[PDB]
């Protein structure tokens, strides 16, 4: 409940501070540290909002949808994707090159979030699942870019940075896949799991995706940079 | 009306897939392919929303406003403008150079859309037209950047890429000008033409602007690259 | 109140036109001119909205959504210009982007959190959010004053002098906003809505119009 949101805020607020301090401030690593440190600060703001039910909509039938949660995802996810794109290019790209991939992957990712929110708010089952599927299509669009063309470039340019990108993407894919799963089985979908259970699961997921991943990604870059 | 939206979605969904696959994946062409392929995918999501009247607000005495339509325009138009800016610079610029023109042209363009939405929703005629005009001012702001300074740079840097930009801009101008015309004539404005007729017209316009233009722009760039 | 908004629109509309015309269209200066000219045009659109009470919420306490909408876009653009100055108009792939994203995220959050504080009808919540917004502002100020300023000075004296001058001016003016909020009807309600509105207009002109011309002069000094 409130306790989960307050735990989320505290973890995310501290983590953001920790990620920046601990993170490298040198050359290419710096801009990765800045991006990774920002995500939790957004998540923190979101979680603080959710504790006081700011942005949280209560349907006539007492059903709750957290706008703040989706608002977080709409900004954070793209920032995490942006960091990955830069890794793939090995921190060098000509005018418009990285920008094109960024725009492509952000558009898909943000749409994935927006469509997911439309699905959540949909009170008609048929519509709810049509939109969920479209969201999933967007997610596959994101995953395709990451796993095929971007990963292709990631490996082509060198083993060290290619190894770092592949490690980061793998971790990202598994964690990111939990969100659509939780949605499906959660109160926004099949309603197999309780609101509180889904919220508690998301907190654990959010910490892995934003905090653990950040420290993991830093180690993979630091290991790769050493070579 | 819903049939038009479903037709729009299907055309835009397929087109997006087609544009990416057909588009070149090499050097400067690649980043143009990625940007051009994204637009229809947004438009598609928008059109799907509109079929189920998701963003659609209904006001008495025949006033409908499709929020999803404007949401599409607020993202797509800038992406199309972004692609043009990159063309003008001949796919090379110093730090912040392209960014300055992007921010400038996006701010004007997005404002043009936002102001247009305010105009559509405005219940006082005087306000509705004040905002329409302000939107038009923004559009002129966009057109100025495209046609004067950006076109100047486009031609100065080389004939091949300059020819491609000029062709793309010309096509852009004519199509983009239809939107303010339809708005004026449409239920959002003078209510001279029916909601359904205006919606069907916009679908035709949207296909030209996002799908036909994409293939046209691609050909003009590939023509310029081969000639060079 | 409406007269202030109409005055704001007219000042901001003309200023934006003036800033572009007067601004240099060459090399690094150009992209600074384009960014600086756009800000007032946003502010203008905002002020026009506010005169006709578009985005203005009646709920007893009144909060101008158009005002915050303006701030959420303009402030980042002004911060973006400063970041570019610090790098001396040269940075490797992703370098400037990382600092931009960092400083924009903090800045935009600062605005949105401030809006949450304004809309909050419960005092305790209103001040929790105000403080969080302030934390974000300090986050912005830190980046500007420490790491970005460090790079600004390290790269050369001329551009380092220009950045330091611009930042100083920015900090002082930008600090008025949280002060006005605190003592204004969105906070302690020590000063009237009209007084706060008229004060913000004066502040907004300094921050977007005067600062633009000041920043332009400082860059032309640095280029010479
Ligand atoms: C390759 C250059 C980067 C393109 C940026 C695309 C701008 C997106 C506009 C979104 C505004 C809403
Ligand atoms: C460094 C330059 C990269 C900047 C990234 C640009 C990303 C643009 C953001 C796109 C957002 C699209 C999501 C909006 C969907 C709205 C569609 C309406 C459906 C109801
Ligand atoms: C929102 C309006 C301004 C968006 C500008 C984004 C352009 C990014 C270029 C680097
Ligand atoms: C040189 C590039 C300048 C980038 C400016 C982008 C402006 C970001 C504002 C978006 C925040 C909107 C929040 C609602
Ligand atoms: C909707 C939010 C999307 C914002 C993501 C923008 C991240 C940009 C990553 C930095 C790119 C810098 C490249 C410079 C060349
Ligand atoms: C060039 C990168 C600018 C993107 C700014 C990030 C927007 C964050 C929104 C909160």
Report whether C166 contacts C218 (CB < 8 A): yes
Residue B120 main-chain phi, psi, to 5 deg: -60, -40
Distances (CA, A) of C95 to A85, A155, C32, C200: 14, 22, 18, 34
CB of B49 within 8 Å of a chain A CB? The answer is yes
Residue A60 main-chain phi, psi, to 5 deg: -45, -35
Closest by CA to B83, choosing from B144, B39, B43, is B39
Locate the ligand 6 atom nearest the alpha carbon of residue B99 and give its number: 1
* Alpha-carbon span C54 to B160, nearest angstrom: 47
Residues of chain B with Cβ-Cβ distance to C28 below 8 Å are: 94, 96
What's the token pair of residue B181? Answer: 């015309």
Report whether C217 contacts C48 (CB < 8 A): no
| Helix runs in chain A, H state only | 2-22, 27-51, 67-88, 97-121, 125-145, 151-156, 159-185, 195-207, 213-226
Closest by CA to B161, choosing from B37, B33, B28, is B28
CB of A145 within 8 Å of a chain C CB? The answer is no
* Alpha-carbon span A56 to A51, nearest angstrom: 10
* Alpha-carbon span C16 to B108, nearest angstrom: 12
* Contact criterion met (CB < 8 Å) for B115 and C87: no
Residues 6+ apart with CB under 8 A from C224: none
Biggest CA–CA distance in chain A, Å, is 59
Length of chain A: 227
The B residues from 147 to 176 touching C (CB cutoff 8 Å) are: 149
Q: What is the DSSP string of B49-72?
A: HHHTTSSEEEETTTEEEEHHHHHH
CB of C139 within 8 Å of a chain A CB? The answer is yes
Distances (CA, A) of B103 to A151, B25, B109, C187: 30, 26, 10, 33
Residues within a 6 A CB radius of ligand 5: A 75, 78-79, 82, 98, 102, 106, 110; C 93-94, 96-97, 101
Query: How was this one solved?
Result: X-ray
* Alpha-carbon span C37 to C21, nearest angstrom: 9
> What count of other Cβ atoms lies within 10 Å of the Cβ of residue A1?
10
Distances (CA, A) of A128 to A222, B157, B181: 43, 51, 36
* Alpha-carbon span A92 to A87, nearest angstrom: 9
CB of A53 within 8 Å of a chain B CB? The answer is no
End-to-end CA distance of chain A: 46
Report whether B180 contacts B136 (CB < 8 A): yes
Q: DSSP code of C58?
A: -
Helix or strand holding residue A64 (H, E): strand A64-66
Q: Which domain holds residue B50?
A: 1-228
Nearest CA in chain C to A93: C93
* Alpha-carbon span B178 to B121, nearest angstrom: 20
| 3-state SS class at A190 | coil
Q: How many domains does chain B have?
A: 1
Report whether B71 contacts B55 (CB < 8 A): yes
Closest by CA to C135, choosing from A50, A41, A25, is A41
Q: Is B110 in the pocket of ligand 3 (CB under 6 A)?
A: yes
Nearest CA in chain A to B72: A111
Distance between Cα A81 and ligand 6 center (Å): 13
Report resolution in angstroms. Answer: 2.8
Q: Give the up-direction half-sphere exposure of residue C195: CA atoms within 13 A in the CB hemisphere.
A: 10
> What count of other Cβ atoms lies within 10 Å of the Cβ of residue A86?
24
Ligand number with the minimum distance to the CA of A42: 6
CB nearest to B52's CB, from A108, A127, A149: A127
Report whether A188 contacts A65 (CB < 8 A): yes
Report whether A39 contacts A76 (CB < 8 A): yes
Closest by CA to C208, choosing from C108, C85, C78, is C78
Residue C220 sits in a domain whose CATH number is 1.20.1070.10
Residues 6+ apart with CB under 8 A from A26: none
Closest by CA to B92, choosing from B42, B158, B141, B37, is B158
> What count of other Cβ atoms lies within 10 Å of the Cβ of residue C134?
17
Locate the ligand 4 atom nearest the alpha carbon of residue C100 and give its number: 4
Tokens 């301090």, located at residue: A21
* Alpha-carbon span B108 to B77, nearest angstrom: 11
* Alpha-carbon span B146 to A156, nearest angstrom: 37
Closest by CA to A114, choosing from B64, C56, C108, B74, is B74
* Alpha-carbon span B88 to A52, nearest angstrom: 49
* Alpha-carbon span C108 to B86, nearest angstrom: 27
* Alpha-carbon span C212 to C224, nearest angstrom: 19
Report whether B110 contacts B74 (CB < 8 A): yes
* Alpha-carbon span C15 to A161, nearest angstrom: 48
Closest by CA to A42, choosing from A9, A64, A20, A18, is A9
Residue A188 main-chain phi, psi, to 5 deg: -80, -10
Residue closest by Cα to atom 10 of ligand 6: C105
Mutate to test the pocket of ligand 1, among A97, A102, A107 (most ligand atoms within 8 A of CB): A102
Q: What is the DSSP string of chain B?
A: -HHHHHHHHHHHHHHHHHHHHHS--SHHHHHHHHHHHHHHHHHHHHHHHHHTTSSEEEETTTEEEEHHHHHHHHHHHHHHHHHHHHHHTTT---TTHHHHHHHHHHHHHHHHHHHHHHHHH-SSHHHHHHHHHHHHHHHHHHHHHIIIIIHHHHHHT-HHHHHHHHHHHHHHHHHHHHHHHHHHHSTTTT--S-HHHHHHHHHHHHHIIIIIHHHHHHHHHHHHHHH-
Residues 6+ apart with CB under 8 A from A188: A65, A119, A120, A198
Rounded (10°) angle between helices A97-121 and A125-145: 160
Report whether A176 contacts A80 (CB < 8 A): no
Residues 6+ apart with CB under 8 A from B219: none
Cα torsion angle, B102, B107, B109, B113, sign: positive
Length of chain B: 228
* Alpha-carbon span B7 to A66, nearest angstrom: 33
Query: Long-range CB contacts (< 8 A, 24+ apart) of C179-186?
Result: C181/C114, C181/C117, C181/C118, C181/C130, C182/C130, C185/C61, C185/C62, C186/C61, C186/C63, C186/C117, C186/C118
Distance between Cα B11 and ligand 5 center (Å): 30
Closest by CA to A91, choosing from A151, A26, A31, A170, is A31
Query: Count of CB contacts below 8 A, A vs C?
Result: 60
* Alpha-carbon span C13 to C37, nearest angstrom: 10
* Alpha-carbon span B106 to B109, nearest angstrom: 5
């Amino acid at each position: 409940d409130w306790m989960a949101f307050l735990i989320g805020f505290t973890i995310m607020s501290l983590a953001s501070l920790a990620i920046y301090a601990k993170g490298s401030k040198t050359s290419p690593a710096l801009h990765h540290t800045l991006l990774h440190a920002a995500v939790p600060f957004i998540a923190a703001t979101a979680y603080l909002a959710m504790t006081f039910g700011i942005g949280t909509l209560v349907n006539f039938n007492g059903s709750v949808t957290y706008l703040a949660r989706y608002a977080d995802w709409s900004v954070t996810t793209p920032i995490l994707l942006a960091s990955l794109v830069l890794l793939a290019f090995h921190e060098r790209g000509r005018t418009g090159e990285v920008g094109g991939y960024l725009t492509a992957i952000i558009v898909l990712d943000v749409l994935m979030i927006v469509t997911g929110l439309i699905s959540s708010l949909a009170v008609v089952p048929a519509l709810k699942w049509v939109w969920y599927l479209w969201s999933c299509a967007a997610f596959l669009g994101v995953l395709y870019l990451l796993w095929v063309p971007l990963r292709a470039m990631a490996v082509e340019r060198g083993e060290a940075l290619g190894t770092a990108y592949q490690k980061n993407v793998a971790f990202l894919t598994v964690i990111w896949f939990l969100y659509p799963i939780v949605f499906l089985i959660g109160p926004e979908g099949l309603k197999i799991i309780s609101d509180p259970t889904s919220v508690w699961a998301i907190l654990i997921m959010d910490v892995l995706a934003k905090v653990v991943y950040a420290f993991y990604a830093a180690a993979n870059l630091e290991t790769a940079l050493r070579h």
